[PDB]
Amino acid sequence: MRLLVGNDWSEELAEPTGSTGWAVQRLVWFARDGDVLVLPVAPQEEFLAYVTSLTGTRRSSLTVVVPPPGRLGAGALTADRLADPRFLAALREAFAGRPVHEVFALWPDAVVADLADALGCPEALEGHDFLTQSGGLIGSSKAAFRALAAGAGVALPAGAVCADRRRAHRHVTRLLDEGSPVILKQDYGSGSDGNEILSRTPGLALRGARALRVLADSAALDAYLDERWDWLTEGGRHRVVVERYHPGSRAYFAEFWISDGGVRLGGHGEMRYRPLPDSQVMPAPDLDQAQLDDLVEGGRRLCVALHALGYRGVLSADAVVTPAGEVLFTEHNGRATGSTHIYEIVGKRVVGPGFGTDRILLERVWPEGWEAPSFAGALTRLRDSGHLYDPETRRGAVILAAYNTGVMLCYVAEDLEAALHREESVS
Amino acid sequence: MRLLVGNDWSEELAEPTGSTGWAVQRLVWFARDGDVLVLPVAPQEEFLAYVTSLTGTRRSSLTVVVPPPGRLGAGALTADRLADPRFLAALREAFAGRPVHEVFALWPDAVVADLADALGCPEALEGHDFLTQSGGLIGSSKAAFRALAAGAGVALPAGAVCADRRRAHRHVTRLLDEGSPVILKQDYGSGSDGNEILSRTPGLALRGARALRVLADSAALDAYLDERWDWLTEGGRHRVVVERYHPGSRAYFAEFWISDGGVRLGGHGEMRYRPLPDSQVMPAPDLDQAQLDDLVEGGRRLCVALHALGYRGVLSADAVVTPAGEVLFTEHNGRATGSTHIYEIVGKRVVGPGFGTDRILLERVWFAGALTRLRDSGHLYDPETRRGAVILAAVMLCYVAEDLEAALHREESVS
Ligand SMILES: Nc1ncnc2c1ncn2[C@@H]1O[C@H](COP(=O)(O)O)[C@@H](O)[C@H]1O
């Protein structure tokens, strides 16, 4: 029996008011026999039965525990929901006298530590003490990333970390006068919504940022900083990362599992900003040996640093390959990412040893313009067309997510072209 | 030579508008033959002569470069003073073609890395890359201390790190309802000035905070938090550390030198309240051997972690020994502290190997007049006897004697 926790982005960083309880249902992919899952919204049985049928996990051995709604409703495991005596009674009955062997959470937050303490199993949560002190936030800080990568000797685009406009203005100006565009980044921003590109020249693709600002001179920059500084600092709370932006780069990741015992490579892939990051392929294609070595060693070094200071959990090291072919690291992500269950479970467990050898994975966000009436409806159509993932041909679409009021698929194929073809058939 | 920078508390954390240039003149103690010293204010010659005669450094081999004044004046090495063309030219002249072998700064700040960049000697600054990304600030973060110590299995008072009022209220309520007093600490607070003690009971001794608030109950604390949170967070800029406070505790430090090659014990001491914090003793007295070992090994584990993440420089780990006898770490300090030149130079270089065996150092807070009268009376430090008062700054004294009782008699004499 393990306790799996489907928690969201840290309550300490942001109010999870938009959450609907859908994305964290990816937790089920990690479930193994006997496990107890804590989720904000009960998954549909059809989702559970499908996912468990593929992982080989006995569904009836699983228990799903859902807290009552909290101060922000049901969308996310807010702190008040996990402290609810009603929920705690439900949790203890789900345990049924069994010891908690391990606590696994999607996000390394103090609320998980709080839960382990309330349950009297802190020892089952690796890095518990670190987490009680809110150490897990380091996994989502770009400022922390910049310092750690630079200290560990991990290649980094030129730049700095700025707490004020005076310093920000100097570092932006240095980079712009070298003929480069610049990307500003919220310390704790999630995704490209937290970034802006600044350029002397118009017409750049908006890859990895919400907006492009064209700034002619020092005065235009003063004007920009005066207007956006509140936003860039989240109301004066956080610092801003300034770094050199490299147009037309491809985005890669190497993800690791950081335990008490040390650092272990989970997997690597490419995130396709095509022009939005709406698909990813694993493992990483089109790198030569030296670039793949740099991506993995770079990430590993970063993770060894994070391990040494006490971080425990999943760590995604994000990088770009520039048009000149240089691997530069751009951030880390301390959490179960969009990729984690895909290479770890779908790749290594469902597809098997052939994954990385004669099989790749291609996941796409449910295309806009695609519609499916329900989970069961999507599965039926896939099953009937013969495009549903078939455990003995090792080809086809794996349904990744629960019903979203469509779903989300992962195509397993010999190479990217083959998966891309599988997908056009799917309709 | 080596380039020695007498910089102050980071300009990124606070405006150093109150500095007068006096404290960073402790830089001179670290000066070795041929070095070049960057100071905000020129030291008196008599001070420079005096320090170098004790340290055995040849004074004429030294150069002091003082940047012109900057936006806050001459009191402190502000970023614009160190990027001044007039200052960079005067600095390259002081080198006169010599390569910079090592850069030593009093504070691990991004401006040091900028200066090393300007001069073309990034390789002479250990942790250069770390510092350009302002990683040195981690050495002044209590929020960082709390996580590092928790992760490193280093003992610390019960508590948490809080970003908002709701979690602070919870964690304060919990400690108070257990009957203990609580101390709130600004993430980047310099000294006790950034701390406040919360208690059910009035009259606690304010060791390490400079105000106490008596809070009867949950609504009283709502009121306090609603009133003080803006100050506690520096305008919602930083988080707040909530800790169990231990009254009547003694305060100790263990200081380490963190370089590429690893972690070296500098020294340890006590910060005495008699009744107030106006004196230091090194090495640490009145500790059992196991308490000293917990102090040093605690400090070491912590520094090993700081090392691994890239920090380079001086790191002082502060601890208290509770009335109950337990050693608990309370903060770290990444910088040359008020103690660093004392055990490292005055102790290990001036006094020699006997320091920590047959000599101890006592420093207390209450120029040629001090020197004259100390000389004429015979109380001035005598290399031949390894006893007497050392003038640490232009004044402040460090009494070298066999034990604390001998040091306190010497000071009484100096009255
Ligand atoms: N939780 C605590 N209990 C007792 N003393 C503390 C605690 N936290 C910090 N202190 C002491 O308060 C002092 C801080 O003041 P300063 O050294 O001037 O910054 C240090 O000596 C700490 O060791």
PDB file of C-alpha atoms in Angstrom, chain B residues 70 208 232 414:
ATOM      1  CA  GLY B  70      28.571  57.417  -5.764  1.00  0.00           C
ATOM      2  CA  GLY B 208      17.980  38.244  19.115  1.00  0.00           C
ATOM      3  CA  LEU B 232       7.489  41.460   8.483  1.00  0.00           C
ATOM      4  CA  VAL B 414      42.272  49.010  30.551  1.00  0.00           C
TER       5      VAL B 414
END
